[PDB]
């Protein structure tokens, strides 16, 4: 089972199409492109029929057998795409997959796709069966390679994407690869030129006019002006209030635990421990350094009222409170 990255697929696919291709991961774009790369190569062969069957912990053995009959009685080149469950294959599924895995041959290409399987789910009869015949494509890019991915994707779009610019694009839409790709394509219509310099890219990014994280990232003791700006510019992208509160909560409770651990362990190791420190470190600590143990608390009450005010009258214009909340994370409060 040649384990490989999305980039590596096209080269392997050239040597020879394998028995099965498992696309395991969470990235919508990555999964699709790999899937498209396999099929584009198959339909070239003679793979006319294409099929997709989704496995649930709820699916009947009668559905598995009924499918087998469908695949087994069809005479020519065909393809089958198994869509793995959201959670991953359970005890029962491992068998139904196993039964299907015994339905293979040269003229029946199997493609399984879902998120990453756990080291446990990977010992499973079905998985180990394809382990010599198949190929696994890890569709899941970390902070260091997000820029590298943007540079790679941009270069194939015939783009001269400057490094600072590249970073700008990265700090905005951090992690939404679908966005970074659209953005690169839009940016190409803007400057037919090809030359994506920082000034150019910067102008178009700011002009386009924000991740709910940019609100928080700003809300981290960074001046309120821009957070209030982003907050009132976050109602212009059609962002629900509720989804904002749970973005603030997650980063807020995180500060609570960290500020609580001073003399518990030096800031350094703590960030690793919480696994979110991914540049956010200096910013997170900058936050910790000017927010008092007590400020942090008050901010938790407000968030709570809001959390209830938004769920008790179910329409009390929480936005107001979000404004008021963003103001507490920058200025010293009182006991009123």
């Amino acid at each position: 089972m040649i384990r490989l990255y999305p980039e590596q697929l096209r080269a392997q696919l050239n040597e020879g199409l394998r028995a099965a291709y498992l696309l395991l991961g969470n990235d919508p774009l990555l999964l699709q492109e790999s899937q498209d790369a396999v099929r584009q190569v198959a339909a070239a062969q003679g793979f006319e029929e294409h099929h997709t069957f989704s496995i649930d912990p709820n699916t009947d053995w009668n559905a598995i057998f009924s499918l087998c009959q469908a695949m087994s009685l069809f005479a020519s080149r065909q393809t089958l795409l198994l869509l793995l469950p959201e959670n991953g294959p359970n005890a029962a599924i491992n068998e139904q997959l196993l039964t299907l895995t015994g339905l293979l041959h040269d003229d029946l290409l199997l493609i399984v796709r879902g998120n990453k399987l756990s080291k446990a789910q990977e010992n499973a009869a079905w998985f180990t069966a394809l382990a010599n015949r198949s190929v696994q494509v890890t569709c899941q890019p970390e902070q260091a390679q997000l820029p590298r991915w943007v540079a790679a994707r941009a270069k194939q779009l015939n783009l001269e994407l400057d490094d600072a610019a590249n970073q700008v694009l990265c700090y905005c839409y951090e992690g939404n690869l679908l966005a970074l790709a659209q953005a690169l394509e839009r940016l190409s219509l803007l400057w037919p030129d090809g030359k994506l310099t920082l000034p150019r890219v910067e102008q178009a990014v700011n002009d386009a006019a924000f991740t709910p994280f940019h609100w928080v990232d700003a809300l981290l003791m960074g001046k309120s002006k821009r957070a209030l700006h982003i907050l009132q510019q976050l109602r212009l992208e059609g962002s629900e209030p509720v989804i904002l509160l749970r973005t603030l909560q997650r980063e807020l409770l995180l500060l609570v635990n960290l500020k609580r651990q001073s003399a518990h362990t030096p800031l350094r190791a703590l960030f690793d421990k919480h696994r979110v420190w991914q540049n956010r470190r200096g910013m997170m600590g900058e936050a910790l350094n000017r927010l008092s143990q007590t400020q942090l608390r008050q901010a938790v009450q407000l968030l709570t009222r809001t959390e209830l005010t938004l769920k008790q009258d179910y329409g009390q214009s929480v936005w107001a409170e979000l404004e008021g909340l963003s103001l507490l994370l920058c200025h010293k409060p009182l006991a009123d």
């Binding site: 919508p28 774009l29 699709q32 679908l178 659209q182 394509e185 839009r186 219509l189 803007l190 037919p192 178009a204 002009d207 386009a208 006019a209 001046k223 309120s224 002006k225 209030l228 700006h229 009132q232 212009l236 992208e237 059609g238 107001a320 008021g324 103001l327 920058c330 200025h331 010293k332 009182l334 009123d336």
Partner: protein
């Protein structure tokens, strides 16, 4: 015979308000013959989603050629603008009563256009298509005929699956209040319809970020102001000037009950929602509390007020600010239990007035 909204429908990329980087992209692509099979337009209901799609369909079909500058005169341009062009097939997944539904219309996709270079399918709220037909659109995008274009548009892009988002070029459409006002000011002038500067602002604010709305709001304003667009007819539907919300607090901390009551009676004559007024006061005193710890507490429309707030922030002790914040806080809670809501407010202030730091009430 002419309603402003209809009369100012944009006839070219050149005159749509402020979505520059969308327009350039489209206009460059339209000049270099670079056009994708399908485009998704997203944004809140109001912005010109469908309207920009027209000008692009209008661009792809103008008899002059494929252009970013369609002449508004040839038959293609005229028909597309009236929305009665053979080839600009327009669906709206939103309604339940279409004659032949999307599935049927999408069936003939591979049929060459009867007129003009492309057969353009403009579908509003694609995220509303029934699954039966949605899949029909999904198959077409995987292998679309070079003579067809899909100009999709949606209010909720999230609701769409990657399958479709990966096969379109998304374009989000962001308006600034001072952007809308300038455009209202212009339309009325070309229409010779009377108007007060405050009036257009009370409208620009109202329409949340969208012209489509501003226009319909102004159309209503006209009918109620019977010809004119006056602050009064506009304040008849969309008030704040009559609000002593800050001049009541000033009057409060200044101690001249005479004024404080005069304000309240004035406010009363206007039919206020008494509790909201106590919110405005409590939300103001809180902000003045903030300008005393950091001067960067002055907001996006704090401008008119600015000097008035800034004066309080320095001339009023923080202890006293807390005292007044508390007195109005308590008076808010007591409100619904008072014998009469106005009475609560009147008495709440009388309490601030009785427990005031400087110049409190006298007794023999």
């Amino acid at each position: 015979y002419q309603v402003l909204a209809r009369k100012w429908r944009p006839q070219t990329f050149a005159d749509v308000v402020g979505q520059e980087h969308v327009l350039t992209a489209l206009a460059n692509g339209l000049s270099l013959g670079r056009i994708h099979h399908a485009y998704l337009f997203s944004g809140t209901r109001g912005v010109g989603k469908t309207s920009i799609a027209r000008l692009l369909a209008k661009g792809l079909n103008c008899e002059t050629g494929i252009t970013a500058t369609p002449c508004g005169v040839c038959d293609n341009c005229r028909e597309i603008e009236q929305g009665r062009f053979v080839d600009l097939i327009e669906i709206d997944a939103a309604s339940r009563t279409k004659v032949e539904d999307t599935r049927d219309l999408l069936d003939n996709v591979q049929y060459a256009p009867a007129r003009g270079r492309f057969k353009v399918y403009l579908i509003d709220e694609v995220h509303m298509l029934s699954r039966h037909s949605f899949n029909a659109l999904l198959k077409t995008l995987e292998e679309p005929p070079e003579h067809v274009k899909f100009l999709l548009a949606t209010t909720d892009p999230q609701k769409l699956p990657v399958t479709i988002l990966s096969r379109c070029l998304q374009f989000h459409l962001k308006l600034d209040v001072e952007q809308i006002r300038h455009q209202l000011e212009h339309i009325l002038n070309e229409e010779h319809i009377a108007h007060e500067p405050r009036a257009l602002q009370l409208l620009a604010r109202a329409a949340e970020g969208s012209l489509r709305d501003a226009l319909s709001l102004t159309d209503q304003a006209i009918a109620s102001g019977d010809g004119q667009v006056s602050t009064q007819a506009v304040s008849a539907m969309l008030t704040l000037d009559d609000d002593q919300a800050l001049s009541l607090v000033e009057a409060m901390v200044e101690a001249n009950g005479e004024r404080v009551m005069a304000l309240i009676n004035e406010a009363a004559a206007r039919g206020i929602e008494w509790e909201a007024l106590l919110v405005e006061m409590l939300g103001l005193l809180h902000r003045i509390a903030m300008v005393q710890l950091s001067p960067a507490a002055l907001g996006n429309d704090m401008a008119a007020i600015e000097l008035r707030m800034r004066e309080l922030a320095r001339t009023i002790p923080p202890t006293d600010i807390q005292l007044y914040y508390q007195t109005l806080l308590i008076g808010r809670k007591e409100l619904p239990y008072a014998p009469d809501r106005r009475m609560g407010v009147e008495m709440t202030l009388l309490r601030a007035l009785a427990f005031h730091p400087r110049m409190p009430l006298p007794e023999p």
